Structures are given as C-alpha cells and as structure tokens.
Design an enzyme around this catalytic site. Structure first.
Site: not given
Ligand SMILES: Cc1cn([C@H]2C[C@H](OP(=O)(O)O)[C@@H](COP(=O)(O)O)O2)c(=O)[nH]c1=O
Ligand SMILES: [Ca+2]
Length: 129
Positions: A34-35, A75, A37, A15, A29
C-alpha cells in the site's frame, strides 16, 4: 508462479498501473503493498518511483498469485516486474509502501516483502523516517 507479458499503457500512482494484458487494457493493483495516496505524504514520491520504473523498462511483466486475480473493482491483482525487477518489492525496500492487504491464499511473496520492509525501517527511509 509465472510471469506473463504486458505492455505499459499508463502509470497511475504508486501501486496501480494501466497495462495491456492479453490484448485488453487492465488496471493492475500491486499485490501485498500500500502506497500513500497522491494526496498524502510520500504519495507523490511513490507515484514518481513506480512511474520511472515501469516507463523506463524495456518490458513489463505481470505475475498472478494462486488466489484472486481481480479485486472487487475489476483491477488485476499481480506482482509487476520491470525488466525482471519486482516493482512491489522495490517500493517496500525504498520505504515508499508498506506491506499490506496480505490475504491467505494470495501471499506467495509475503516474506520477501517483509524482509524488504524490515531493511527500509532499519534504514529509516521515507515512510519510516
Ligand atoms: C491490494 C488489494 C486491495 N484490495 C481492495 C481492498 C480495499 O477495499 P476498500 O476500497 O474497500 O478499502 C482496496 C484498497 O486499494 P487501494 O489501496 O488502491 O485503495 O482494494 C483487495 O481486495 N485485494 C488486494 O489484494
Ligand atoms: Ca494505495
């Protein structure tokens, strides 16, 4: 929403992809998904799916939603398209991502993607098997 140009720098995982946007490198991103890890079940499959998709495309495009364009990690938050086909949707249709992180004000394609997820779940694909 509108599609803007980007040039693939590297596929990173299911993702996230690094791409040149307005002439600067950006890690994108994918909105609304959510893919797993890479270390998790279907992680390697999700990573290879998105990699094939963006690397085989003649062009990629990024489409921001109406709300936040960058998350707290810097991102870019976008829908990514590979020759006009949305990556975010495709991952969900294949059961390689769940619909997730659906925030009010940044959820234009939510219903499109929930429909895909229902289809993948109905077909018992990947995550859903
Ligand atoms: C997809 C997305 C993730 N994020 C943030 C929330 C999550 O914070 P936390 O890292 O604190 O869990 C993290 C999840 O991404 P990843 O799934 O790449 O880890 O990215 C956003 O803020 N907005 C979004 O639209
Ligand atoms: Ca992910």
């Amino acid at each position: 929403l509108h599609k803007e140009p980007a040039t693939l720098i590297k596929a990173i995982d299911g993702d996230t992809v690094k791409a040149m946007y307005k002439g600067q490198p950006m890690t994108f991103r994918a909105l609304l998904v959510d893919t797993p890890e890479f270390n998790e079940k279907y992680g390697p499959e999700a990573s290879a799916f998105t990699k094939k998709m963006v690397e085989n495309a003649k062009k990629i495009e990024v489409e921001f939603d109406k709300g936040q364009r960058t998350d707290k990690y810097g991102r870019g938050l976008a829908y990514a398209y590979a020759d006009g086909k949305m990556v975010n949707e495709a991952l969900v249709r294949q059961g390689l991502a769940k619909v997730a992180y659906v925030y009010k004000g940044n959820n234009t394609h939510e219903q499109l993607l929930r429909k895909a997820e229902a289809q993948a779940k109905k077909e018992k694909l990947n995550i859903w098997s």
